[PDB]
Amino acid sequence: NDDIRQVYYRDKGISHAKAGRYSQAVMLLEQVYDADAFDVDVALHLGIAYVKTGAVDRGTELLERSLADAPDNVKVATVLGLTYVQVQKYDLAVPLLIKVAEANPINFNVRFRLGVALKNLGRFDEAIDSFKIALGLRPNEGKVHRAIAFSYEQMGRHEEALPHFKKANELD
């Protein structure tokens, strides 16, 4: 039968998604995804693959349905949170990325994107906090020194900004 074939496309699809083979994931997972037999692992992996292959609205919507179906799933909160940052819905990204950072404290990208979201919302002290954690993870990331410098500057904290601007220029 096709049911066992179907199981094979599903797992291979999910595995393409996880490896960053996003086009191949879309090709496989479109053939398995079923909206009235909803499987959150397929939905979440096809969802991020859509966002990555340019079908941003279609993917966001699958990610949002995944969030409705599985409110505690950290993988969904990861891909949806980072997608909201990519589309500038900073509002909606913050709660999601906080929860993921609490669950995976050495996920650098999540911590950084949380800092970015907070910054763009004008929550500079919170932003700074997240940027210091991001620098503890990767002390030589130029982009974090630049973001934290800007955030300290926005608050009038020039003394604290200055070595971060010097470091971003050293790593440049």
XYZ file of N, CA, C and O in Angstrom:
688
model
N 0.755 -1.308 0.000
C 0.000 0.000 0.000
C 0.799 1.384 0.000
O 2.039 1.511 0.280
N 0.032 2.417 -0.356
C 0.442 3.789 -0.167
C 0.623 4.195 1.335
O 1.493 4.989 1.582
N -0.134 3.681 2.320
C 0.049 4.123 3.755
C 1.500 4.006 4.307
O 2.010 4.869 5.046
N 2.168 2.937 3.932
C 3.537 2.756 4.295
C 4.486 3.658 3.434
O 5.514 4.177 3.907
N 4.135 3.821 2.170
C 4.807 4.766 1.305
C 4.698 6.196 1.867
O 5.698 6.896 2.005
N 3.468 6.597 2.185
C 3.139 7.823 2.860
C 4.031 8.036 4.116
O 4.653 9.109 4.249
N 4.136 7.027 4.997
C 4.995 7.156 6.175
C 6.450 7.492 5.768
O 7.124 8.288 6.436
N 6.893 6.932 4.660
C 8.250 7.127 4.170
C 8.484 8.597 3.641
O 9.475 9.221 3.942
N 7.534 9.119 2.883
C 7.576 10.512 2.391
C 7.538 11.494 3.562
O 8.256 12.480 3.575
N 6.740 11.182 4.562
C 6.596 12.038 5.712
C 7.917 12.163 6.446
O 8.378 13.286 6.692
N 8.537 11.033 6.797
C 9.730 11.093 7.597
C 10.932 11.642 6.786
O 11.723 12.414 7.297
N 11.041 11.281 5.532
C 12.071 11.821 4.665
C 11.897 13.343 4.442
O 12.882 14.125 4.484
N 10.652 13.759 4.272
C 10.333 15.175 4.173
C 10.797 15.956 5.401
O 11.451 17.009 5.267
N 10.447 15.426 6.580
C 10.750 16.066 7.877
C 12.227 16.099 8.014
O 12.806 17.098 8.381
N 12.875 15.047 7.592
C 14.301 15.039 7.668
C 15.013 15.992 6.656
O 16.113 16.520 6.937
N 14.397 16.256 5.518
C 14.934 17.247 4.623
C 14.823 18.646 5.261
O 15.772 19.465 5.227
N 13.666 18.921 5.840
C 13.448 20.162 6.532
C 14.450 20.423 7.626
O 14.904 21.530 7.769
N 14.762 19.416 8.414
C 15.653 19.563 9.535
C 17.060 19.808 9.064
O 17.813 20.446 9.794
N 17.447 19.211 7.938
C 18.789 19.415 7.369
C 18.873 20.748 6.567
O 19.930 21.122 6.065
N 17.795 21.491 6.440
C 17.883 22.694 5.631
C 17.670 22.470 4.106
O 17.860 23.366 3.309
N 17.214 21.284 3.733
C 16.844 20.994 2.332
C 15.404 21.405 2.082
O 14.488 20.598 1.922
N 15.184 22.696 2.053
C 13.813 23.167 2.196
C 12.921 22.890 0.977
O 11.760 22.624 1.134
N 13.480 22.987 -0.221
C 12.717 22.745 -1.472
C 12.254 21.291 -1.548
O 11.124 21.024 -1.872
N 13.181 20.387 -1.234
C 12.890 19.008 -1.150
C 11.894 18.655 -0.074
O 11.046 17.800 -0.298
N 11.953 19.329 1.044
C 10.934 19.168 2.076
C 9.536 19.604 1.574
O 8.539 18.903 1.838
N 9.452 20.748 0.906
C 8.174 21.164 0.351
C 7.681 20.126 -0.629
O 6.527 19.806 -0.677
N 8.564 19.608 -1.468
C 8.105 18.686 -2.479
C 7.530 17.435 -1.811
O 6.466 16.985 -2.201
N 8.212 16.892 -0.793
C 7.742 15.664 -0.150
C 6.484 15.889 0.750
O 5.450 15.213 0.568
N 6.565 16.873 1.662
C 5.516 17.185 2.620
C 4.204 17.740 2.021
O 3.136 17.521 2.582
N 4.213 18.425 0.898
C 2.922 18.735 0.236
C 2.080 17.498 -0.075
O 0.883 17.592 -0.220
N 2.727 16.349 -0.231
C 2.051 15.101 -0.651
C 1.502 14.356 0.571
O 0.748 13.401 0.450
N 1.915 14.778 1.757
C 1.460 14.113 2.940
C 0.604 14.991 3.765
O -0.277 14.493 4.390
N 0.812 16.309 3.744
C 0.075 17.187 4.656
C -1.420 17.029 4.392
O -1.817 16.962 3.245
N -2.228 16.982 5.461
C -3.716 16.828 5.352
C -4.384 17.645 6.464
O -4.309 17.283 7.648
N -5.029 18.741 6.069
C -5.654 19.682 6.999
C -6.826 19.104 7.864
O -7.082 19.591 8.950
N -7.533 18.073 7.406
C -8.502 17.377 8.304
C -8.017 15.960 8.689
O -8.788 15.015 8.797
N -6.698 15.858 8.862
C -6.029 14.791 9.617
C -4.669 15.416 10.032
O -3.574 15.044 9.532
N -4.779 16.422 10.907
C -3.697 17.375 11.191
C -2.546 16.779 12.042
O -2.757 16.295 13.151
N -1.325 16.830 11.487
C -0.163 16.227 12.130
C 0.824 17.365 12.332
O 1.323 17.932 11.373
N 1.071 17.723 13.582
C 1.749 18.964 13.860
C 3.226 18.923 13.353
O 3.733 19.925 12.895
N 3.886 17.775 13.376
C 5.281 17.663 12.948
C 5.443 17.868 11.429
O 6.429 18.445 10.947
N 4.501 17.371 10.665
C 4.411 17.668 9.242
C 4.092 19.126 9.052
O 4.763 19.806 8.278
N 3.099 19.635 9.777
C 2.674 21.052 9.594
C 3.824 22.029 9.892
O 4.135 22.953 9.136
N 4.537 21.764 10.947
C 5.580 22.676 11.358
C 6.784 22.653 10.439
O 7.303 23.704 10.134
N 7.174 21.474 9.979
C 8.245 21.318 9.015
C 7.853 21.802 7.598
O 8.686 22.408 6.921
N 6.617 21.616 7.163
C 6.227 22.096 5.844
C 6.107 23.603 5.969
O 6.482 24.377 5.056
N 5.636 24.047 7.138
C 5.456 25.483 7.348
C 6.745 26.267 7.234
O 6.805 27.298 6.574
N 7.795 25.800 7.877
C 9.019 26.535 7.778
C 9.615 26.396 6.369
O 10.297 27.321 5.849
N 9.339 25.282 5.717
C 9.887 25.096 4.373
C 9.196 26.031 3.420
O 9.810 26.516 2.460
N 7.915 26.255 3.631
C 7.217 27.252 2.789
C 7.813 28.606 3.047
O 8.097 29.353 2.108
N 8.040 28.963 4.306
C 8.501 30.342 4.553
C 9.836 30.495 3.829
O 10.095 31.503 3.170
N 10.683 29.468 3.911
C 12.051 29.568 3.378
C 12.095 29.600 1.858
O 13.013 30.237 1.264
N 11.153 28.898 1.222
C 11.074 28.875 -0.269
C 10.198 29.996 -0.809
O 9.811 30.009 -1.967
N 9.883 30.955 0.041
C 9.238 32.189 -0.410
C 7.726 32.240 -0.243
O 7.129 33.306 -0.488
N 7.099 31.119 0.166
C 5.653 31.100 0.356
C 5.378 31.476 1.805
O 4.904 30.665 2.588
N 5.664 32.740 2.121
C 5.725 33.256 3.477
C 4.320 33.273 4.134
O 4.168 32.823 5.283
N 3.298 33.786 3.433
C 1.917 33.808 3.979
C 1.419 32.379 4.169
O 0.806 32.080 5.163
N 1.647 31.504 3.206
C 1.088 30.179 3.298
C 1.750 29.463 4.494
O 1.073 28.783 5.253
N 3.045 29.664 4.681
C 3.754 29.045 5.763
C 3.455 29.601 7.143
O 3.315 28.813 8.113
N 3.382 30.935 7.255
C 3.021 31.563 8.504
C 1.678 30.926 8.955
O 1.548 30.466 10.094
N 0.720 30.821 8.046
C -0.580 30.305 8.403
C -0.498 28.893 8.889
O -1.233 28.573 9.775
N 0.374 28.036 8.322
C 0.508 26.696 8.865
C 1.162 26.688 10.233
O 0.906 25.837 11.105
N 2.099 27.594 10.387
C 2.791 27.733 11.664
C 1.778 28.212 12.699
O 1.721 27.709 13.815
N 0.902 29.108 12.322
C -0.119 29.591 13.274
C -1.116 28.529 13.645
O -1.523 28.435 14.820
N -1.527 27.705 12.691
C -2.392 26.576 13.034
C -1.658 25.597 13.922
O -2.244 25.012 14.823
N -0.370 25.400 13.664
C 0.409 24.497 14.546
C 0.432 25.030 15.961
O 0.375 24.250 16.912
N 0.569 26.349 16.089
C 0.559 26.952 17.422
C -0.773 26.740 18.123
O -0.788 26.463 19.327
N -1.873 26.869 17.392
C -3.201 26.594 17.972
C -3.341 25.125 18.403
O -3.921 24.826 19.442
N -2.839 24.200 17.605
C -2.951 22.771 17.928
C -1.988 22.330 19.056
O -2.305 21.443 19.801
N -0.806 22.921 19.157
C 0.231 22.449 20.097
C 0.883 23.665 20.824
O 2.009 24.030 20.541
N 0.164 24.273 21.768
C 0.579 25.499 22.448
C 1.869 25.414 23.259
O 2.388 26.448 23.628
N 2.336 24.209 23.586
C 3.574 24.020 24.367
C 4.723 23.461 23.521
O 5.840 23.230 24.028
N 4.471 23.227 22.235
C 5.524 22.716 21.401
C 6.638 23.761 21.135
O 6.407 24.792 20.531
N 7.843 23.467 21.610
C 8.975 24.349 21.510
C 9.483 24.445 20.063
O 9.981 25.499 19.631
N 9.357 23.384 19.296
C 9.803 23.472 17.905
C 8.920 24.443 17.131
O 9.417 25.201 16.338
N 7.633 24.465 17.402
C 6.730 25.371 16.686
C 7.039 26.767 17.137
O 7.145 27.668 16.348
N 7.202 26.957 18.430
C 7.452 28.309 18.919
C 8.772 28.792 18.361
O 8.953 29.958 18.123
N 9.664 27.886 18.024
C 10.946 28.308 17.446
C 10.741 28.825 16.051
O 11.115 29.929 15.747
N 10.140 28.044 15.184
C 10.065 28.437 13.786
C 9.094 29.599 13.619
O 9.319 30.474 12.761
N 8.022 29.618 14.409
C 7.077 30.711 14.286
C 7.669 31.973 14.863
O 7.626 33.002 14.263
N 8.274 31.886 16.018
C 8.958 33.043 16.566
C 9.989 33.676 15.637
O 9.959 34.890 15.416
N 10.858 32.856 15.049
C 11.848 33.408 14.135
C 11.211 33.906 12.843
O 11.677 34.872 12.247
N 10.162 33.255 12.379
C 9.473 33.791 11.217
C 8.860 35.173 11.586
O 8.991 36.102 10.842
N 8.247 35.340 12.757
C 7.692 36.661 13.054
C 8.715 37.735 13.088
O 8.481 38.879 12.677
N 9.899 37.407 13.566
C 10.990 38.374 13.470
C 11.377 38.673 12.023
O 11.616 39.827 11.667
N 11.471 37.642 11.189
C 11.773 37.855 9.795
C 10.729 38.770 9.176
O 11.111 39.651 8.385
N 9.442 38.672 9.541
C 8.456 39.565 8.851
C 8.117 40.820 9.635
O 7.224 41.549 9.269
N 8.855 41.070 10.710
C 8.765 42.302 11.502
C 7.535 42.383 12.439
O 7.186 43.466 12.938
N 6.980 41.213 12.807
C 5.942 41.169 13.828
C 6.588 40.879 15.169
O 6.514 39.756 15.757
N 7.234 41.916 15.675
C 8.126 41.809 16.797
C 7.369 41.498 18.088
O 7.808 40.667 18.958
N 6.229 42.183 18.190
C 5.142 41.994 19.142
C 4.906 40.509 19.417
O 4.931 39.986 20.538
N 4.642 39.828 18.311
C 4.217 38.447 18.359
C 5.410 37.496 18.563
O 5.267 36.437 19.126
N 6.596 37.881 18.113
C 7.795 37.059 18.313
C 8.237 36.954 19.773
O 8.717 35.872 20.202
N 8.108 38.029 20.545
C 8.776 38.050 21.889
C 8.402 36.897 22.804
O 9.262 36.139 23.228
N 7.114 36.689 23.041
C 6.691 35.578 23.965
C 7.218 34.200 23.517
O 7.640 33.345 24.318
N 7.193 34.007 22.189
C 7.542 32.761 21.644
C 9.040 32.506 21.819
O 9.450 31.390 22.202
N 9.863 33.527 21.569
C 11.294 33.338 21.632
C 11.783 33.295 23.089
O 12.752 32.584 23.397
N 11.120 34.015 23.990
C 11.435 33.860 25.385
C 11.312 32.368 25.811
O 12.229 31.831 26.423
N 10.222 31.700 25.407
C 9.930 30.357 25.876
C 10.993 29.424 25.305
O 11.504 28.532 26.003
N 11.370 29.632 24.046
C 12.370 28.774 23.421
C 13.746 28.977 24.102
O 14.494 27.997 24.298
N 14.077 30.238 24.458
C 15.370 30.535 25.065
C 15.501 29.906 26.493
O 16.579 29.382 26.874
N 14.403 29.975 27.236
C 14.310 29.302 28.497
C 14.525 27.793 28.297
O 15.296 27.249 29.058
N 13.945 27.168 27.243
C 14.160 25.718 27.011
C 15.505 25.296 26.384
O 15.963 24.174 26.701
N 16.100 26.140 25.501
C 17.380 25.895 24.854
C 18.376 27.084 25.088
O 18.579 27.925 24.154
N 18.985 27.187 26.273
C 19.789 28.348 26.575
C 21.115 28.513 25.802
O 21.742 29.573 25.901
N 21.554 27.533 25.024
C 22.718 27.799 24.180
C 22.319 27.905 22.716
O 23.161 27.712 21.834
N 21.036 28.208 22.440
C 20.641 28.465 21.050
C 20.904 29.937 20.864
O 20.144 30.783 21.313
N 21.986 30.214 20.170
C 22.463 31.576 19.999
C 21.506 32.397 19.158
O 21.122 33.502 19.564
N 21.117 31.849 18.012
C 20.268 32.576 17.099
C 18.996 33.006 17.711
O 18.568 34.111 17.487
N 18.374 32.158 18.528
C 17.117 32.521 19.173
C 17.352 33.677 20.118
O 16.621 34.645 20.129
N 18.427 33.605 20.890
C 18.706 34.653 21.848
C 18.933 35.977 21.142
O 18.441 37.014 21.571
N 19.698 35.939 20.054
C 19.989 37.138 19.289
C 18.728 37.778 18.688
O 18.543 38.999 18.793
N 17.894 36.962 18.020
C 16.650 37.432 17.402
C 15.695 37.967 18.476
O 14.955 38.941 18.256
N 15.692 37.379 19.647
C 14.893 37.986 20.766
C 15.405 39.382 21.079
O 14.661 40.318 21.236
N 16.704 39.509 21.235
C 17.320 40.813 21.456
C 16.927 41.773 20.332
O 16.563 42.915 20.613
N 16.953 41.310 19.079
C 16.598 42.179 17.961
C 15.139 42.685 18.016
O 14.866 43.884 17.811
N 14.214 41.779 18.313
C 12.809 42.097 18.472
C 12.568 43.149 19.578
O 11.859 44.099 19.387
N 13.196 42.954 20.731
C 13.079 43.855 21.887
C 13.614 45.247 21.478
O 13.003 46.278 21.678
N 14.753 45.250 20.818
C 15.352 46.492 20.383
C 14.407 47.291 19.488
O 14.238 48.494 19.631
N 13.820 46.622 18.522
C 12.961 47.285 17.543
C 11.651 47.720 18.159
O 10.989 48.530 17.599
N 11.268 47.115 19.284
C 10.151 47.581 20.117
C 10.575 48.675 21.119
O 9.733 49.130 21.900
N 11.845 49.090 21.154
C 12.208 50.183 22.076
C 12.412 49.660 23.518
O 12.524 50.414 24.459
N 12.507 48.350 23.700
C 12.737 47.804 25.010
C 14.224 47.507 25.199
O 14.683 46.364 25.325
N 14.978 48.578 25.303
C 16.399 48.513 25.184
C 17.058 47.794 26.355
O 18.062 47.065 26.107
N 16.530 47.931 27.590
C 17.196 47.244 28.780
C 17.052 45.756 28.662
O 17.990 44.977 28.975
N 15.862 45.342 28.242
C 15.612 43.903 27.977
C 16.506 43.385 26.826
O 17.064 42.293 26.870
N 16.646 44.222 25.814
C 17.439 43.916 24.636
C 18.898 43.691 25.060
O 19.537 42.664 24.722
N 19.426 44.686 25.761
C 20.759 44.586 26.304
C 20.978 43.270 27.102
O 21.972 42.549 26.882
N 20.039 42.951 27.992
C 20.140 41.697 28.777
C 20.345 40.510 27.834
O 21.278 39.727 28.048
N 19.531 40.406 26.778
C 19.586 39.278 25.867
C 20.891 39.306 25.044
O 21.531 38.234 24.759
N 21.317 40.515 24.687
C 22.574 40.631 23.956
C 23.732 40.200 24.812
O 24.622 39.561 24.295
N 23.728 40.470 26.109
C 24.882 40.003 26.945
C 24.902 38.449 26.974
O 25.942 37.797 27.026
N 23.735 37.847 27.014
C 23.703 36.362 26.997
C 24.217 35.907 25.633
O 25.027 34.989 25.533
N 23.874 36.636 24.581
C 24.283 36.199 23.249
C 25.792 36.264 23.155
O 26.428 35.326 22.596
N 26.397 37.324 23.722
C 27.889 37.437 23.740
C 28.637 36.433 24.646
O 29.792 36.035 24.360
N 28.053 36.099 25.774
C 28.540 34.924 26.500
C 28.572 33.665 25.624
O 29.554 32.943 25.687
N 27.565 33.433 24.762
C 27.610 32.294 23.843
C 28.690 32.425 22.748
O 29.528 31.517 22.566
N 28.712 33.570 22.078
C 29.689 33.874 21.004
C 30.336 35.275 21.179
O 29.836 36.298 20.600
N 31.450 35.332 21.971
C 32.049 36.614 22.366
C 32.581 37.441 21.208
O 32.791 38.641 21.385
N 32.802 36.816 20.050
C 33.291 37.528 18.857
C 32.266 37.716 17.715
O 32.632 37.917 16.544
N 30.977 37.696 18.043
C 29.984 38.049 17.029
C 29.879 39.580 16.940
O 29.336 40.218 17.818
N 30.437 40.141 15.851
C 30.370 41.572 15.517
C 28.960 42.119 15.541
O 28.709 43.176 16.142
N 28.027 41.407 14.926
C 26.636 41.914 14.828
C 26.011 42.099 16.214
O 25.207 42.972 16.392
N 26.401 41.305 17.203
C 25.863 41.545 18.539
C 26.475 42.784 19.274
O 25.797 43.522 20.000
N 27.776 42.972 19.118
C 28.426 44.154 19.618
C 27.814 45.378 18.982
O 27.597 46.346 19.703
N 27.493 45.347 17.680
C 26.902 46.528 17.050
C 25.506 46.753 17.656
O 25.199 47.858 18.078
N 24.689 45.711 17.754
C 23.303 45.896 18.261
C 23.271 46.353 19.693
O 22.463 47.196 20.067
N 24.144 45.797 20.530
C 24.099 46.181 21.949
C 24.652 47.610 22.102
O 24.269 48.352 22.991
N 25.591 47.987 21.241
C 26.162 49.337 21.311
C 25.067 50.307 20.981
O 24.884 51.276 21.696
N 24.354 50.066 19.902
C 23.256 50.939 19.505
C 22.220 51.069 20.642
O 21.742 52.151 20.927
N 21.916 49.960 21.320
C 20.880 49.947 22.343
C 21.319 50.746 23.543
O 20.527 51.508 24.120
N 22.562 50.568 23.950
C 23.086 51.366 25.060
C 23.088 52.867 24.644
O 22.672 53.727 25.395
N 23.506 53.175 23.427
C 23.459 54.557 22.933
C 22.060 55.152 22.994
O 21.876 56.242 23.473
N 21.061 54.417 22.566
C 19.678 54.923 22.595
C 19.145 55.343 23.989
O 18.276 56.232 24.117
N 19.690 54.700 25.007
C 19.395 54.995 26.381
C 20.329 56.045 27.005
O 20.318 56.176 28.212
N 21.203 56.691 26.239
C 22.203 57.608 26.817
C 23.333 56.929 27.591
O 24.039 57.594 28.324
N 23.552 55.616 27.414
C 24.576 54.926 28.184
C 25.848 54.756 27.350
O 26.302 53.665 27.017
N 26.477 55.896 27.115
C 27.542 56.035 26.175
C 28.777 55.366 26.721
O 29.573 54.750 25.984
N 28.969 55.465 28.011
C 30.135 54.845 28.602
C 30.125 53.334 28.356
O 31.149 52.729 28.013
N 28.972 52.726 28.542
C 28.841 51.320 28.280
C 28.879 50.934 26.779
O 29.311 49.844 26.420
N 28.465 51.848 25.920
C 28.419 51.599 24.466
C 29.822 51.512 23.927
O 30.141 50.651 23.094
N 30.676 52.400 24.423
C 31.919 52.701 23.712
C 32.780 51.448 23.442
O 33.199 51.274 22.324
N 33.052 50.577 24.461
C 33.910 49.377 24.128
C 33.236 48.404 23.153
O 33.916 47.744 22.358
N 31.906 48.358 23.182
C 31.199 47.556 22.205
C 31.341 48.136 20.818
O 31.544 47.394 19.883
N 31.305 49.457 20.658
C 31.514 49.990 19.294
C 32.947 49.694 18.859
O 33.207 49.479 17.669
N 33.872 49.739 19.811
C 35.322 49.516 19.496
C 35.484 48.075 19.055
O 36.155 47.819 18.074
N 34.853 47.149 19.765
C 34.899 45.734 19.391
C 34.264 45.442 18.039
O 34.854 44.695 17.249
N 33.094 46.005 17.743
C 32.492 45.795 16.417
C 33.424 46.314 15.306
O 33.435 45.810 14.200
N 34.165 47.365 15.585
C 35.047 47.872 14.592
C 36.313 46.978 14.489
O 36.807 46.802 13.398
N 36.769 46.381 15.602
C 37.900 45.423 15.615
C 37.577 44.183 14.786
O 38.405 43.695 14.034
N 36.353 43.689 14.925
C 35.893 42.507 14.219
C 35.185 42.900 12.899
O 34.073 42.439 12.631
N 35.826 43.721 12.071
C 35.181 44.331 10.896
C 36.167 44.533 9.731
O 35.974 43.975 8.644
